Structures are given as structure tokens and as C-alpha cells.
Design a protein around this ligand. Structure first.
Ligand SMILES: C=C(C)[C@H]1CN[C@H](C(=O)O)[C@H]1CC(=O)O
Ligand SMILES: C=C(C)[C@H]1CN[C@H](C(=O)O)[C@H]1CC(=O)O
Lengths: 262, 262
């Protein structure tokens, strides 16, 4: 039948999607700003469709409950037909790839370590060997799953450490993880995706730092319901945007062009 | 009908696929060794299929002739039904994605600069600003296309320089590009994918070096004919291998474990 406005599901997480300071004076998609907001506009332009940016109701990303087997977050909204496409820093993982379609990566990243400047830690191995400096991750998401399911000695030990550490080394949000690193006087290292780490390292008060190399290598992908008709075009749009150097420009814009740390 | 042995098309290019020193005494897939040979074994194991490693007849990777519109290389073998899957460092590009299916990236890379140690060059911008130190790429492939189609000022200038430079700054093979850098006493810089660059930097006589950051960000993908039944399983296998840390181990094995430069 007739074309329909594409429902885009995303989530508020800086600097990917944020409500403009003057959002109360704007409307529709114009209320938001950020890397993903810009990416969505570019994808829509190339694929030639109108869209509406919506915020995922449950505020989750994409995990399936072991008991009920129900998918939450943006993945769930695609799986159950609540949204047509998800545009956010959604990590491409096996479990998600099995239920929805992912475009090729629009951003490359890996799990990294965030420390307050001055902390005597240079790698994950360094962390695994001690307990004075506590370390944890988000209480849900791809990074936590990485450690939970890892069979690699170092990461396996880090996981066992994390589950038994007191007080809890887990945080509910990125802002919480960042704030804990900053207020813990060097006694807390935060494991998060390099992208977020690199972003925070350029924000005042400039007291955090990304150390060591990434623990893994992966990417963020645009997701659509399995078999969806938009899948193909969106995937080609992603590759096109990357080849035109558009994606690198968007990262620079939201990560470095306005860096606040020199 | 009954399952059939999967025909895998690949190409001799170190350290991805090479004929063993004692190949004349071995048979079938055992005649070859390398990163891709190992990857193929792992993919086949996870997807549960028997396969035969074959070498692409025309020795090309995957480009379409503008006049005849015929696809050459491994892409062509998939497009015309000569092979069931291609396992090699095949760069995921828009033009190829339009005719065949790619798995998510099994390796992340970008175009980089290779120089003989001592060369006064730190970036592509540095190269673009001069002509004393000649610079070029392979006479075909993704890297050449990157420069040919680029609209980015610096890369556009580099391309115009390359097309008009005398003698020709292009090479036919990686080994040729490497050899030219080594024998040109610092008067030749070679533009190639970071993966090959990092590999060569660890091989005797240890006289080359990778300088500056990558010009772009992309990946290598396993390819299958569009709509192929193996596509799904192979894609999930790739993600699984990466999540198990298997892909990083394979890179270490063929790139660094035996590094010859300290
Ligand atoms: C910001 C959040 C909660 C997301 C972003 N990508 C990951 C995901 O898609 O699971 C999560 C971060 C992480 O796991 O470190
Ligand atoms: C080694 C060769 C000729 C291949 C490997 N990947 C690229 C491709 O798939 O086109 C080519 C290298 C390059 O373009 O620098």
C-alpha cells in the first residue's frame, strides 16, 4: 500500500541522542540532537523516507529474559512490531543478530578501561591482579555479557571478581559509571565501550583517561525487524555514508570538534 | 536434496592463504595454510559442513567491468555460481554489497601509509603536499577505488597526483608495493590496508613502518551469493568466533606470535 512514515526507536544517551537545550520551543524530530539524530537524517535522506524519532518506552537496549523469553528495549520494539528501525549505539552481538537484522557497522569500537588520571592501571590484566582499585561495568548490556560469558582466563577472573566484590562494582548508567570514576579518588576503574570513553575524555573536568588497548573488536549497527524491507536500503546507505567520509565527520563533530580539554 | 561439499573460493595472498612449504607431500585443503585457511576451518566446523578450498581462476578479487558489466574475481565466482562462498581479506564495499552477501566484519581495518624507516612523512596530508617522495597504490582494488572516487580535498589531490605521476606509482601486487618501498631508498610511500601494513612491519628485514592514522574505517567480510542459504549460518559463525576471542587469536598467530622484528 501507500508509503508510511517510518517509526524510528532510539534512546537518550549522549552524545548519540539528547534533547536540545531549547527543546520546549521546538517540535518533532527537531527537539533532539546528536550523532544518531544526524545519522538518522542522513539514512532517511539516502533511502528516501519520512520518519519519526521515538524514545524506547522501557529505556532498555536489547536483551531477552531467560524465563519469559521476551525481548526488551529497542530490539524488543523491532521484534514485536512497535518500531520499524532502531538507530542508536546498539552493539552488534550474536544473540541480537539472531532475532533482528543489523546493517554493517556504522561505528567501530571495543571494550576499554576508564580511569581517573593518576590511577596505577595500564591494562585489564593489571586490574585482574588486584582489588585495591575496584572495577565494574553497567549492570546490563553487551559489556557485562562479555565478561559474564567469557572463557578467557583474565576476563573470567575479572568476572568472578566483579560478582563477589563489595560494595557492588556495577552501575546503572554511563553517567553513573563516569561519576563514580571521578568521585572515587582513583579507587574505581570503569569498563565501557571505547566510543563512550573517548567522548568523556574530551569533557570537563578532564580528569578521566582511556588506558590500555581494547579488550575486543566490534561495532554498532542500525537494526530492523528480521526480513524487513528497509533492511537492504539502510545497509547500503550505511556503507555509502562511510565511504563518503560522512560518518567520520559526524564522529568528529560530536566527539572532538568541540573537545573541552585542549 | 542431499548436502553437497561447499566450494570455497579464495586467493593466494600472505598471510591469509599460502601453499605450505611441503605442499607437494600433502593433499586437498591440507596443502594450504594461513589466517583464512584457519578461519574457513572454524566457520565450517561451526556451520557443520564439508568444504573444498579452491583458488579463484582469474586471480582477481571483485570488480565489475564498466563496459561488459561482468564481475571478475571471487565476487564474480559467487555471482555466476562457480563458488558457494569466498573466504579472503575481501573488503566490504558498497558496490560489492549490491551483488553478493557479506557477513559482518571478521577483521577491522583502514587504508594506511607504508614507508621505509627514515622517510620524512607522518600523514597523507604530508604526502599530498609534495612530490619528492612518490606514492601510489595497487592498480586495482578497494584502496585504488577509494582514491579514485573520493571527493575529500586531500584524497582528491592525492588521486590527481597519482594519475599524472611519472613513472607510474601503481603496483600490481602487495609484494611489489612492499619491494618498491624497500628498494626506493625512501622515495616511495605505499598506500595499503593497515592489516597488510602491520603484517609487513613484523617481517625481516624490518625496514618498513606504518605511519599516521588510517584514512578510513572498514572491514573484511565472508561473501556468499545473494540470497544464499549459507549466508545466515556463516554470519552467526563469524560473530560467534569473534565473541569467543578466536579471531583475535588467529590474527596474533599469523601476525605477531612469530614476529621477526623483536
Ligand atoms: C550505553 C549502553 C547501555 C549500551 C550502548 N551499546 C551497548 C549495548 O548495545 O549493549 C551498551 C554499553 C555497554 O554494554 O557497555
Ligand atoms: C590484496 C588485495 C589486492 C585486496 C585485499 N582487500 C582489498 C580488496 O578486497 O579490494 C585489496 C587491497 C587494497 O585494495 O589495498
Amino acid at each position: 500500500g501507500a508509503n508510511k512514515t517510518v517509526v524510528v526507536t532510539t534512546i537518550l544517551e549522549s552524545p548519540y541522542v539528547m534533547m536540545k537545550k531549547n527543546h520546549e520551543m521546538l517540535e518533532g524530530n527537531e527537539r533532539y540532537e546528536g550523532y544518531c539524530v544526524d545519522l538518522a537524517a542522513e539514512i532517511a535522506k539516502h533511502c528516501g523516507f519520512k520518519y519519526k524519532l521515538t524514545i524506547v518506552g522501557d529505556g532498555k537496549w536489547g536483551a531477552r529474559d531467560a524465563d519469559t523469553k521476551i525481548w526488551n528495549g529497542m530490539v524488543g520494539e523491532l521484534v514485536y512490531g512497535k518500531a520499524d528501525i532502531a538507530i542508536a549505539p546498539l552493539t552488534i552481538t550474536l544473540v541480537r543478530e539472531e532475532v533482528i537484522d543489523f546493517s554493517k557497522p556504522f561505528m567501530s569500537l571495543g571494550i576499554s578501561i576508564m580511569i581517573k588520571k593518576g590511577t596505577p592501571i595500564e591494562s585489564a590484566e593489571d586490574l585482574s591482579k588486584q582489588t585495591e582499585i575496584a572495577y565494574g561495568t553497567l549492570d546490563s548490556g553487551s559489556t557485562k555479557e562479555f565478561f559474564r560469558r567469557s572463557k578467557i582466563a583474565v576476563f573470567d577472573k575479572m568476572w568472578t571478581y566483579m560478582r563477589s566484590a563489595e560494595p557492588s562494582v556495577f552501575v546503572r548508567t554511563t553517567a553513573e559509571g563516569v561519576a563514580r570514576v571521578r568521585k572515587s579518588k582513583g579507587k574505581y576503574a570503569y569498563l565501557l565501550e571505547s566510543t563512550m570513553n573517548e567522548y568523556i575524555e574530551q569533557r570537563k573536568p578532564c580528569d578521566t583517561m582511556k588506558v590500555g588497548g581494547n579488550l575486543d573488536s566490534k561495532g554498532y549497527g542500525i537494526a530492523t525487524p528480521k526480513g524487513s524491507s528497509l533492511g537492504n536500503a539502510v545497509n547500503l546507505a550505511v556503507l555509502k555514508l562511510n565511504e563518503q567520509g560522512l560518518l567520520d565527520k559526524l564522529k568528529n563533530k560530536w566527539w572532538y570538534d568541540k573537545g573541552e580539554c585542549g
